[PDB]
Structure formats: structure tokens, C-alpha cells
Write an enzyme that holds these catalytic residues in place. Structure first.
Site, PDB file in Angstrom:
ATOM      1  N   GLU A  35      42.992  40.370  52.378  1.00  0.00           N
ATOM      2  CA  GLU A  35      42.483  39.800  51.137  1.00  0.00           C
ATOM      3  C   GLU A  35      41.284  38.915  51.301  1.00  0.00           C
ATOM      4  O   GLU A  35      40.295  39.092  50.585  1.00  0.00           O
ATOM      5  CB  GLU A  35      43.605  39.074  50.386  1.00  0.00           C
ATOM      6  CG  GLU A  35      44.735  39.956  49.820  1.00  0.00           C
ATOM      7  CD  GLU A  35      44.273  40.901  48.732  1.00  0.00           C
ATOM      8  OE1 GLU A  35      43.220  40.699  48.146  1.00  0.00           O
ATOM      9  OE2 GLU A  35      45.082  41.839  48.563  1.00  0.00           O
ATOM     10  N   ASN A  46      35.770  40.603  39.444  1.00  0.00           N
ATOM     11  CA  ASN A  46      36.120  41.975  39.011  1.00  0.00           C
ATOM     12  C   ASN A  46      35.291  42.226  37.744  1.00  0.00           C
ATOM     13  O   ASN A  46      35.733  41.841  36.647  1.00  0.00           O
ATOM     14  CB  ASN A  46      37.639  42.056  38.862  1.00  0.00           C
ATOM     15  CG  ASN A  46      38.289  41.594  40.165  1.00  0.00           C
ATOM     16  OD1 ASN A  46      37.970  42.128  41.245  1.00  0.00           O
ATOM     17  ND2 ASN A  46      39.136  40.580  40.113  1.00  0.00           N
ATOM     18  N   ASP A  49      37.160  43.972  34.694  1.00  0.00           N
ATOM     19  CA  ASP A  49      38.082  43.370  33.698  1.00  0.00           C
ATOM     20  C   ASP A  49      37.729  41.920  33.415  1.00  0.00           C
ATOM     21  O   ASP A  49      38.495  41.303  32.657  1.00  0.00           O
ATOM     22  CB  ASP A  49      39.557  43.542  34.018  1.00  0.00           C
ATOM     23  CG  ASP A  49      40.056  42.579  35.097  1.00  0.00           C
ATOM     24  OD1 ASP A  49      39.267  42.058  35.895  1.00  0.00           O
ATOM     25  OD2 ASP A  49      41.292  42.364  35.114  1.00  0.00           O
ATOM     26  N   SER A  51      37.885  39.389  35.431  1.00  0.00           N
ATOM     27  CA  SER A  51      38.788  38.368  36.060  1.00  0.00           C
ATOM     28  C   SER A  51      38.183  38.063  37.437  1.00  0.00           C
ATOM     29  O   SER A  51      37.289  38.794  37.921  1.00  0.00           O
ATOM     30  CB  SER A  51      40.220  38.887  36.123  1.00  0.00           C
ATOM     31  OG  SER A  51      40.245  40.003  37.009  1.00  0.00           O
ATOM     32  N   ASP A  53      39.396  36.738  41.557  1.00  0.00           N
ATOM     33  CA  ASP A  53      40.420  36.574  42.599  1.00  0.00           C
ATOM     34  C   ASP A  53      39.949  35.332  43.415  1.00  0.00           C
ATOM     35  O   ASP A  53      38.796  35.291  43.857  1.00  0.00           O
ATOM     36  CB  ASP A  53      40.575  37.773  43.495  1.00  0.00           C
ATOM     37  CG  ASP A  53      40.908  39.068  42.731  1.00  0.00           C
ATOM     38  OD1 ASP A  53      41.719  39.065  41.821  1.00  0.00           O
ATOM     39  OD2 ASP A  53      40.268  40.012  43.211  1.00  0.00           O
ATOM     40  N   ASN A  60      44.694  36.334  41.302  1.00  0.00           N
ATOM     41  CA  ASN A  60      43.915  36.713  40.118  1.00  0.00           C
ATOM     42  C   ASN A  60      44.068  35.780  38.917  1.00  0.00           C
ATOM     43  O   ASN A  60      45.155  35.368  38.509  1.00  0.00           O
ATOM     44  CB  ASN A  60      44.267  38.157  39.722  1.00  0.00           C
ATOM     45  CG  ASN A  60      43.282  38.655  38.618  1.00  0.00           C
ATOM     46  OD1 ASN A  60      43.671  38.556  37.442  1.00  0.00           O
ATOM     47  ND2 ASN A  60      42.150  39.153  39.113  1.00  0.00           N
TER      48      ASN A  60
END
Ligand SMILES: [Ca+2]
Length: 130
Positions: A35, A46, A49, A51, A53, A60
Site C-alpha cells: 500500500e 482516486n 471517485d 476520494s 487514500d 480511504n
């Protein structure tokens, strides 16, 4: 801050991640590795969408923390996304624990399925004395 492998392994063990909801320490190490590369400051937007992380576990913003700019978002960990970008992973961990308490568990992170599931993950903790 960027952790060294064994330094993070020993930290997570102290924080009670070994066997948390049936997830071995090696699994958590595998997840942090793919990650963020063990980087607490890591962030991924992202575009798809809207959003983001955040942190070592790439938590998220749609469901777990508040960044204010994510549409239709909830803050299940009751944390500012901000908190997941500092050098203390105590809240990151408390939040990661919250994620896996949902039906889906660790499968909530697609990288785990891709990179860690049904793999020999001992590599991540060998020689760390955990
Ligand atoms: Ca933190």
C-alpha cells in the site's frame, strides 16, 4: 516517516495487530508494504471517485476518515484524514482495526488479494524477532 521492515513489525506487534480478528502480523506487513512502502506520508488521489487514500495503510476517505472534499463520505474512524499522515501510527492502527471489523475484513484492500492472499508471506517478518 518511512519505517524499516523490522522496526514496523515490532511496532505493530506492540499495538496488538498479531492475530487481530484472525489476521497474522505477516499479513498486515504485506498490506503496508504494497500500500505505502511503509511510508506514513503516502497519499493516493482516486480521480475516478474523488476520494483519497491516506497513510501507511492507505485508508480511504469515502468511509473511514474526514478530508471534507470527498462527496457522500462517512468518517467511521472519527478521525481527520490528516491524522493518518503524521509519524505516529497509533491512530492509523486503531482505524485499520475498525476497517477489518466490517463484513469484508482485510479483503477491503484489493492489493491484499492481489499481493498477499494465499502467498507465503513469512518473508515480511523473518528475522524481526516478533
Ligand atoms: Ca497517525
Amino acid at each position: 516517516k518511512v519505517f524499516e521492515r523490522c522496526e514496523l513489525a515490532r511496532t505493530l506487534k506492540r499495538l496488538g495487530m498479531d492475530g487481530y480478528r484472525g489476521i497474522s502480523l505477516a499479513n498486515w506487513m504485506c498490506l503496508a508494504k504494497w500500500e505505502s512502502g511503509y511510508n506514513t506520508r503516502a497519499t493516493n488521489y482516486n480521480a475516478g471517485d474523488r476520494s483519497t487514500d491516506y497513510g501507511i495503510f492507505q485508508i480511504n476517505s469515502r468511509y473511514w476518515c474526514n478530508d471534507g472534499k470527498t462527496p457522500g463520505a462517512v468518517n467511521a474512524c472519527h478521525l481527520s484524514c490528516s491524522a493518518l499522515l503524521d509519524d505516529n501510527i497509533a491512530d492509523d492502527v486503531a482505524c485499520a482495526k475498525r476497517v477489518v471489523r466490517d463484513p469484508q475484513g482485510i479483503r477491503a484492500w484489493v492489493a491484499w488479494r492481489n499481493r498477499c492472499q494465499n502467498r507465503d508471506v513469512r518473508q515480511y517478518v523473518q528475522g524481526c524477532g516478533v
